[PDB]
Tab-separated table of C-alpha atoms and ligand atoms in Angstrom:
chain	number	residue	atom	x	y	z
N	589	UNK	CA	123.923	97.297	107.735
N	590	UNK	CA	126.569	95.100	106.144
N	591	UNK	CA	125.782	95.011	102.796
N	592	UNK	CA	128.473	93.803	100.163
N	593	UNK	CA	129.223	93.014	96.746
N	594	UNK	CA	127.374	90.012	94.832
N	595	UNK	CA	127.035	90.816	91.709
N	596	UNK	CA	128.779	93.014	89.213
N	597	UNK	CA	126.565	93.512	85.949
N	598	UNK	CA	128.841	94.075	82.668
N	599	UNK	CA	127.575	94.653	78.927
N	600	UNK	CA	126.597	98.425	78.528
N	601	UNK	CA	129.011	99.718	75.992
N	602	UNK	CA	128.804	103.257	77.611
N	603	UNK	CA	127.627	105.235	80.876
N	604	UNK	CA	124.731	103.609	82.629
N	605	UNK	CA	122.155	106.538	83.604
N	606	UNK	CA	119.747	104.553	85.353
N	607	UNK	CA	119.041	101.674	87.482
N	608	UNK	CA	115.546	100.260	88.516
N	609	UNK	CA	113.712	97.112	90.528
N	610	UNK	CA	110.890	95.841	89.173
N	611	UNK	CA	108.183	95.824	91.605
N	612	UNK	CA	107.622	92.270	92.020
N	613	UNK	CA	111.399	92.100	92.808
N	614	UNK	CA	112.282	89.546	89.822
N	615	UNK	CA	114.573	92.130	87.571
N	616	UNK	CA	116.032	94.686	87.600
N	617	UNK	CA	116.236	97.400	84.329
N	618	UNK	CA	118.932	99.696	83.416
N	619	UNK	CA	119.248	102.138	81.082
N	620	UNK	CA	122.344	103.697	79.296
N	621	UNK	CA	123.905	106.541	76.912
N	622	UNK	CA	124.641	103.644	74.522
N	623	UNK	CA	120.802	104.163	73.398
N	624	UNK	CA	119.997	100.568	75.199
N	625	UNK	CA	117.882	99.227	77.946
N	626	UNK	CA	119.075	96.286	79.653
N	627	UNK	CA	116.897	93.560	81.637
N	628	UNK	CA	119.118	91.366	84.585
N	629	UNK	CA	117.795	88.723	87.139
N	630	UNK	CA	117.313	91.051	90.378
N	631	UNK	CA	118.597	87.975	92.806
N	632	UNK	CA	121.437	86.433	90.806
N	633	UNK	CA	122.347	89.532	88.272
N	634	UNK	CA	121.811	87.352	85.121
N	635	UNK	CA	121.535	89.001	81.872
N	636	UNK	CA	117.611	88.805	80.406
N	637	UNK	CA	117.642	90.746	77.254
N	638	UNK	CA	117.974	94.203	75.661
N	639	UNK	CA	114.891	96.339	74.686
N	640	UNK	CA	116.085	98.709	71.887
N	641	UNK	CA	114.747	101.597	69.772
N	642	UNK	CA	115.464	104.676	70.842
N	643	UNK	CA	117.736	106.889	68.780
N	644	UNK	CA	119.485	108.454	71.148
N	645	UNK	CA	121.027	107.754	74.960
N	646	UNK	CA	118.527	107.270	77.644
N	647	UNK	CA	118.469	108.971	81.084
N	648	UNK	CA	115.859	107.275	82.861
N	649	UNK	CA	113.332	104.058	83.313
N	650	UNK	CA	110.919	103.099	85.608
N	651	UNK	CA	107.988	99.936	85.597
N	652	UNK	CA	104.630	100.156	85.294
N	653	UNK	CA	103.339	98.535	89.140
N	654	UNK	CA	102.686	95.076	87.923
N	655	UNK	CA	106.042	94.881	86.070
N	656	UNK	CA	104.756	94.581	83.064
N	657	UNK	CA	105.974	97.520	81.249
N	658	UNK	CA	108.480	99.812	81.469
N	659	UNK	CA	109.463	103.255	80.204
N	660	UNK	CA	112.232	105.242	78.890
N	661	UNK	CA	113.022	108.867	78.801
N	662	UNK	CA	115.979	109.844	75.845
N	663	UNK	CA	117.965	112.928	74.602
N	664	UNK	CA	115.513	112.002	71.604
N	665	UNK	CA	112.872	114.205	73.037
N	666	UNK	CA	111.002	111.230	73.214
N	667	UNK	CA	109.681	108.274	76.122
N	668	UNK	CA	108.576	105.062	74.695
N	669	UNK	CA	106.369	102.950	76.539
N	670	UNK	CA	107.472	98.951	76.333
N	671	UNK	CA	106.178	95.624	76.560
N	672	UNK	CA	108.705	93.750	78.888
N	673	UNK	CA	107.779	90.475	78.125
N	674	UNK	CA	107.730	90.773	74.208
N	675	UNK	CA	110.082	93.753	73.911
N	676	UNK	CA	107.245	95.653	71.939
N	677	UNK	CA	107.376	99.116	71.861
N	678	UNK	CA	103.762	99.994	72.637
N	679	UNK	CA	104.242	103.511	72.351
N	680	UNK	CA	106.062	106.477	71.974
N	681	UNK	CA	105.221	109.862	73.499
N	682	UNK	CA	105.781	113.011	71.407
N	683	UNK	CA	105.766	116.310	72.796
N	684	UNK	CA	109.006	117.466	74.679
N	685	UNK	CA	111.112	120.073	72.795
N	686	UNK	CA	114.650	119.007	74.596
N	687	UNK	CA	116.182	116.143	75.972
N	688	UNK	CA	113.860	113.763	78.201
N	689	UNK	CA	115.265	113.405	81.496
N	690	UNK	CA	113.347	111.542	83.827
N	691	UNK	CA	110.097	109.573	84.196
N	692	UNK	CA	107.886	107.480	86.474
N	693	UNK	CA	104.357	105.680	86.305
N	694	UNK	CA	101.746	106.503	89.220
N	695	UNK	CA	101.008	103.112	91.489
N	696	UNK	CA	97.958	102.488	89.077
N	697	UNK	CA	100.275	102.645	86.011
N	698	UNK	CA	97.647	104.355	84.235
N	699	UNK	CA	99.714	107.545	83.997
N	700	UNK	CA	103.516	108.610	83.307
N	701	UNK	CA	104.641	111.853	84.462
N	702	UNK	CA	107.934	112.573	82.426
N	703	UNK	CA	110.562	115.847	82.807
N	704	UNK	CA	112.726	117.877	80.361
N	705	UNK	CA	115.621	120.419	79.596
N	706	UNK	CA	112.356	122.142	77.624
N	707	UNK	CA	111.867	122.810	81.623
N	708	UNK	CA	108.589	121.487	81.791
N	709	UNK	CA	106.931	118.767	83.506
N	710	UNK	CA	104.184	116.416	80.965
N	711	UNK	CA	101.211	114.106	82.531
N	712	UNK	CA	100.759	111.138	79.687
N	713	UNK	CA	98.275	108.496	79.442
N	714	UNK	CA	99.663	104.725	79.198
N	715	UNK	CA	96.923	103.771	76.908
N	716	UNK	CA	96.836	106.405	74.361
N	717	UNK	CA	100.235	107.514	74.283
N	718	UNK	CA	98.936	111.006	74.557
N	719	UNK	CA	99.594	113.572	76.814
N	720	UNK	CA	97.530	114.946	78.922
N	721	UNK	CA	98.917	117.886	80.500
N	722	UNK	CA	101.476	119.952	80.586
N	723	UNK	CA	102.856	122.209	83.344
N	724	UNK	CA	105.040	125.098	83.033
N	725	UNK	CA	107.000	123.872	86.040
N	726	UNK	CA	110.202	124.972	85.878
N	727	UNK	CA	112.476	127.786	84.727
N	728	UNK	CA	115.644	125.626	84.334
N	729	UNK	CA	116.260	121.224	83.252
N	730	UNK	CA	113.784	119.187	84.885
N	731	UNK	CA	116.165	116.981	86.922
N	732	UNK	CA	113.027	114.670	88.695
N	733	UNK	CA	109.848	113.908	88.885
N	734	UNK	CA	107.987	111.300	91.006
N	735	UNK	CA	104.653	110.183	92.080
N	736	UNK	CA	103.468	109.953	95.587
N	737	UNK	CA	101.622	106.670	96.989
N	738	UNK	CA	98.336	107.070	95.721
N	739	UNK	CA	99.127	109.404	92.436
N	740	UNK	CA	97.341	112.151	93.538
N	741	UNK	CA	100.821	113.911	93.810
N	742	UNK	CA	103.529	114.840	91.621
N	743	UNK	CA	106.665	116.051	92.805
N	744	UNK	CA	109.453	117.776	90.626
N	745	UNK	CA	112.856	119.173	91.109
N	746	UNK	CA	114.988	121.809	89.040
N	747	UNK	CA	118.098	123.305	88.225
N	748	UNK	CA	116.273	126.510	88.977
N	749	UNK	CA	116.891	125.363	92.681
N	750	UNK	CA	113.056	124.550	93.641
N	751	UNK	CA	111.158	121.508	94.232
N	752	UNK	CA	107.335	121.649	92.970
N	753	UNK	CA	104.120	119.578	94.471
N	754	UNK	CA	101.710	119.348	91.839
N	755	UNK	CA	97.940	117.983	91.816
N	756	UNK	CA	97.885	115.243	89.538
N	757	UNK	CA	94.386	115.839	88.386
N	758	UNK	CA	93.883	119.663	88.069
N	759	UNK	CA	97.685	120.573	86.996
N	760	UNK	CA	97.801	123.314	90.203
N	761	UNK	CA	101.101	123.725	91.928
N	762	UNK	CA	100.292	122.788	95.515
N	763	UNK	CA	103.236	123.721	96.875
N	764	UNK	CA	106.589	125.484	96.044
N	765	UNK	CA	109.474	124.133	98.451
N	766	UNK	CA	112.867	126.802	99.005
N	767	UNK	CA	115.382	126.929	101.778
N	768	UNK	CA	117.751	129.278	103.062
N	769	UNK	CA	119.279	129.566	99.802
N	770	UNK	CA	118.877	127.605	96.385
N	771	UNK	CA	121.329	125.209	94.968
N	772	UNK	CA	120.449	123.320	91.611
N	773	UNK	CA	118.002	120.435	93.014
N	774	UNK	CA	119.135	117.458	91.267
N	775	UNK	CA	116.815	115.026	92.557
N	776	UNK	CA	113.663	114.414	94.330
N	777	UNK	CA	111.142	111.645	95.454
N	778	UNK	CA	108.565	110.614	98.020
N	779	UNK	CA	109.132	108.615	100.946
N	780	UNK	CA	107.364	104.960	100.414
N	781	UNK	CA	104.670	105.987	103.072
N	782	UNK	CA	103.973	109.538	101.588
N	783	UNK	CA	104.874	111.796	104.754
N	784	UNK	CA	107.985	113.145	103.234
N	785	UNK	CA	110.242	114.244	100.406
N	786	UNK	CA	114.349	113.431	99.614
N	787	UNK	CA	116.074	116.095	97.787
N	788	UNK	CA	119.522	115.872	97.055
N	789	UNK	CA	121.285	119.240	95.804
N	790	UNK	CA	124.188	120.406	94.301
N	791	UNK	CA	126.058	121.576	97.089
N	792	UNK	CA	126.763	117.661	98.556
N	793	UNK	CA	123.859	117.863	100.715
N	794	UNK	CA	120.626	115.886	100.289
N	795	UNK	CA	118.031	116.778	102.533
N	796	UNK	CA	114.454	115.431	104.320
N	797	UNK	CA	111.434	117.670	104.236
N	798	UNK	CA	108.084	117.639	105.755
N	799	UNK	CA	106.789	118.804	102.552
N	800	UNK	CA	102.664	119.219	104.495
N	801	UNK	CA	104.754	121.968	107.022
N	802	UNK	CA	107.252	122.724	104.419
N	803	UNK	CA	110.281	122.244	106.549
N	804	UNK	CA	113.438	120.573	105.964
N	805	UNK	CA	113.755	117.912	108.889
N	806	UNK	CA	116.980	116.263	108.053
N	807	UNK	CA	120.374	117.447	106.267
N	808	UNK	CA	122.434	114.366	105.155
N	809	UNK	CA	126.087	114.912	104.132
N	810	UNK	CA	129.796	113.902	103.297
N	811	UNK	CA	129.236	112.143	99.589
N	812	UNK	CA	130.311	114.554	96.926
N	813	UNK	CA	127.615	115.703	94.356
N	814	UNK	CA	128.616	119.048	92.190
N	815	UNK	CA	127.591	118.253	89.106
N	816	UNK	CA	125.301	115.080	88.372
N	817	UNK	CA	121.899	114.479	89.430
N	818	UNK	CA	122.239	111.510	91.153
N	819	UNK	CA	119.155	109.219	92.150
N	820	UNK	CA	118.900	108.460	96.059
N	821	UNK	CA	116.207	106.293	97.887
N	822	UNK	CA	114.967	105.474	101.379
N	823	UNK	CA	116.003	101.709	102.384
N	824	UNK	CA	112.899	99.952	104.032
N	825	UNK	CA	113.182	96.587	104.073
N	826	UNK	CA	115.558	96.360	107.043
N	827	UNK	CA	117.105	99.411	108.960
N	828	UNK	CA	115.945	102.677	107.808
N	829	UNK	CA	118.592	104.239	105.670
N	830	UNK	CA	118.892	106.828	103.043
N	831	UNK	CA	121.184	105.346	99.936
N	832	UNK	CA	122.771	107.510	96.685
N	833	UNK	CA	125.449	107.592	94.580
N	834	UNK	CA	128.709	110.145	94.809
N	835	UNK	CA	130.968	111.628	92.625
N	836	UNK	CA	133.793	110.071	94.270
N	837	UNK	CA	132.708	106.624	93.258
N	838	UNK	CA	131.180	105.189	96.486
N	839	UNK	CA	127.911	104.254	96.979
N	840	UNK	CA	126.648	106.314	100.918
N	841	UNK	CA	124.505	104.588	103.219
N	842	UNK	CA	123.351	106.628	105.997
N	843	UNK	CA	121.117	106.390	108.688
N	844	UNK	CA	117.634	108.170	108.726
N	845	UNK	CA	117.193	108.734	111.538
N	846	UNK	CA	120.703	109.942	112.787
N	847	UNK	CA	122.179	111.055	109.782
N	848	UNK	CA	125.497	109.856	110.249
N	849	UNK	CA	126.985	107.953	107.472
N	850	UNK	CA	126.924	104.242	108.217
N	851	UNK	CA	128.473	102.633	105.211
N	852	UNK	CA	130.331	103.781	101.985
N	853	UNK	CA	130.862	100.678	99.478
N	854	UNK	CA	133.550	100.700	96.954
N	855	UNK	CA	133.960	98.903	94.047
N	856	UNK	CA	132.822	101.290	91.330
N	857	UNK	CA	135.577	102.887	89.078
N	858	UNK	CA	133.551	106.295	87.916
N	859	UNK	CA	130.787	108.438	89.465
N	860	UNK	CA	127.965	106.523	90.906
N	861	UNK	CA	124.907	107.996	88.957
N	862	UNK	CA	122.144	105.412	90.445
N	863	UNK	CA	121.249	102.886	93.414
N	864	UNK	CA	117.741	101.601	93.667
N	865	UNK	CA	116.859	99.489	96.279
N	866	UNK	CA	115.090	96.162	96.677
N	867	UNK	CA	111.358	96.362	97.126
N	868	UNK	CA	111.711	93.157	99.521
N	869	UNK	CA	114.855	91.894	100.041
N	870	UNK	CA	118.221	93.958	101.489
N	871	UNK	CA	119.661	94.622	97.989
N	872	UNK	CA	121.251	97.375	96.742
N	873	UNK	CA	121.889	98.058	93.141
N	874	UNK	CA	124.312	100.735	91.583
N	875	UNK	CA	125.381	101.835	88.571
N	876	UNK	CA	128.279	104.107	87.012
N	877	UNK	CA	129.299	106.364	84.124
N	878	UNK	CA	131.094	106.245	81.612
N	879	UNK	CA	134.514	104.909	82.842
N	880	UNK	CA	133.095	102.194	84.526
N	881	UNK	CA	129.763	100.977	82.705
N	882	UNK	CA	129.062	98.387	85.340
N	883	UNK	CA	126.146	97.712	87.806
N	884	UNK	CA	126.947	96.296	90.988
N	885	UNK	CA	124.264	94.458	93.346
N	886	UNK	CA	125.276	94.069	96.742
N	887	UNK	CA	123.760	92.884	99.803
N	888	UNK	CA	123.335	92.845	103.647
P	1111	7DC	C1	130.760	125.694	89.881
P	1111	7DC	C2	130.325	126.648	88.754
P	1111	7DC	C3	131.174	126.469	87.544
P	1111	7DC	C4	128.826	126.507	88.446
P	1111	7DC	C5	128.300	127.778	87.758
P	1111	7DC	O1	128.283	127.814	86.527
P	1111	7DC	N1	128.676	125.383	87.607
P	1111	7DC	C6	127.725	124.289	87.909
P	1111	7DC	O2	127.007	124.311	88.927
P	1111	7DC	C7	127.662	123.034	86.909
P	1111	7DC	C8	128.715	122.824	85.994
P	1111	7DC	C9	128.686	121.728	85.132
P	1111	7DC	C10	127.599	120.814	85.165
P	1111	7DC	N2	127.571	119.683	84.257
P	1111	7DC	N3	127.104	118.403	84.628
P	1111	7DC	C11	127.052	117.322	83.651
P	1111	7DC	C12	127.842	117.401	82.503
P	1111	7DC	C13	127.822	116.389	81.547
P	1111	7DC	C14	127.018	115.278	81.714
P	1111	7DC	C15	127.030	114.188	80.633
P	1111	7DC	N4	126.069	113.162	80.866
P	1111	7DC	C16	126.512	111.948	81.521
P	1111	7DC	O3	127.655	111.823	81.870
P	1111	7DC	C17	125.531	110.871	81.818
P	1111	7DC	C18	125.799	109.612	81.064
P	1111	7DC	N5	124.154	111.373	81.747
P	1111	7DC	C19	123.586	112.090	82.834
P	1111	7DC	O4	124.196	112.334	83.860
P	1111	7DC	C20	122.132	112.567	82.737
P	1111	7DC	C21	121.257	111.443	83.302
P	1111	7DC	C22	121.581	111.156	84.795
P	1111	7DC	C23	120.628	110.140	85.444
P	1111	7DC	N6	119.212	110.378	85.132
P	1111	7DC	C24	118.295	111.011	86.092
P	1111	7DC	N7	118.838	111.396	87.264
P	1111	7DC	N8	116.942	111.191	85.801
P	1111	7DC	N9	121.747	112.802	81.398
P	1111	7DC	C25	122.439	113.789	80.607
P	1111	7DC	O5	123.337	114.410	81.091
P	1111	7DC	C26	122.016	114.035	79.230
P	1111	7DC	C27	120.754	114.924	79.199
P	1111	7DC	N10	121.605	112.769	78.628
P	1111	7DC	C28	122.604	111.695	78.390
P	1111	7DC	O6	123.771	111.881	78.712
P	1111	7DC	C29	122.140	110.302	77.724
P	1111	7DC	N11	122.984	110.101	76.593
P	1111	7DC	C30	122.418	109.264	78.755
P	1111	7DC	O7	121.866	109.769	80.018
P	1111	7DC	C31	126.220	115.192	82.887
P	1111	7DC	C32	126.249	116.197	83.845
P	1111	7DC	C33	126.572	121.017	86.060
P	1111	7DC	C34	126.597	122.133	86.951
């Protein structure tokens, strides 16, 4: 692809932790350590507004699937659910012993599944603010957790080196994913159509699995990642590539289906922490830590 820099996205006062399209591919949401989340046109990267409230930094966000609502997962032990439209917090979900660390809605945005340093993985329900379950998933930091494309899956990711596959409705681990050896998993997610799962690991490798056979299919490498847990995605609206961020400051586009690395953009000053990727259009957005504080929107 030949995607390149549109946009650059200034006004977080610290690191950005999170980047996000909304589904109907108007905005785009970010969230940052500066306790703030941030609301930008998705097509021209105009500032919207800021939703505030939590008391601590925020490591995560992610919209309900009529973009409606979003929600927010802090070092405050807590998620709040939000209006987007009014900034109303609707709710706040209370249960978490440690740091919240990542979140995400099911596709009928009846549900949020939300993960923790407290090493466990919590089911909540968007009406009641209550949760519903919680599973003992982990024996390290919950570094992901993501719904697959009807919500009858969870999938979850760990320091402890495993990804998890959990039955949203019973609780059950369906599944317990390991490779020839276990580096901290840092981050893990569905492929749009279901069939697969990314991981991306400590060791500068992210990797495809056939999570139904439970075999690793594809190894993609060359970006640096040591020591963040960096969101990556599968690009679908044009070529089929596989996007993340890199501790050396470059955003990596490779190709699926090869796995050779078929762009690396620049522009970013500090570790790329996020890209999410445009549910219709070619866009790419990015965001950096502390050193940097911008998000960049680029395009092929
Ligand atoms: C090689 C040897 C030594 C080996 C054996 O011991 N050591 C390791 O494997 C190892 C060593 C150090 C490691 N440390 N890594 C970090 C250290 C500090 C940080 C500080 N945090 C940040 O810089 C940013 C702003 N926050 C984060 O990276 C994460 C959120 C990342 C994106 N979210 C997501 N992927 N769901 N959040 C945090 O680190 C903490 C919990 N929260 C915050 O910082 C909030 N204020 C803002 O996120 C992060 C990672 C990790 C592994």
């Amino acid at each position: 692809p030949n995607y390149a820099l549109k946009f650059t996205l200034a006004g977080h006062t610290k690191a950005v932790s999170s980047v996000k399209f909304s589904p109907n591919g108007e905005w785009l949401a970010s969230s940052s350590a500066d306790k703030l989340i941030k609301i930008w046109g998705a097509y021209d990267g105009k500032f919207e507004k800021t939703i505030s409230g939590h008391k601590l930094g925020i490591s995560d966000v992610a919209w309900s699937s009529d973009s409606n609502l979003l929600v927010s997962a802090s070092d405050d032990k807590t998620l709040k659910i939000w209006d987007v439209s009014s900034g109303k917090c609707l709710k706040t979900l209370k249960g978490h012993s440690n740091y919240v660390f990542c979140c995400n809605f099911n596709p009928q945005s009846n549900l949020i599944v939300s993960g923790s340093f407290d090493e466990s993985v919590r089911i909540w329900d968007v009406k009641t603010g209550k949760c519903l379950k919680t599973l003992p998933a982990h024996s390290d930091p919950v570094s992901a957790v993501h719904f697959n494309r009807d919500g009858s899956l969870i999938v979850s990711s760990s320091y402890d080196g495993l990804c998890r596959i959990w039955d949203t409705a019973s609780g059950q681990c369906l599944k317990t994913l390991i490779d020839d050896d276990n580096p901290p998993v840092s981050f893990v997610k569905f492929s749009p159509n279901g069939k697969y799962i990314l991981a991306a690991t400590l060791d500068n490798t992210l990797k495809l699995w056939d999570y139904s056979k439970g075999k690793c299919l594809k190894t993609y490498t060359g970006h640096k990642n040591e020591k963040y847990c960096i969101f990556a995605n599968f690009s679908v609206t044009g070529g089929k590539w596989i996007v993340s961020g890199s501790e050396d400051n470059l955003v990596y586009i490779w190709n699926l289906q090869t796995k050779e690395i078929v762009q690396k953009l620049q522009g970013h000053t500090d570790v790329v922490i996020s890209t999410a990727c445009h549910p219709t259009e070619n866009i790419i957005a990015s965001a950096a830590l502390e050193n940097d504080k911008t998000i960049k929107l680029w395009k092929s």
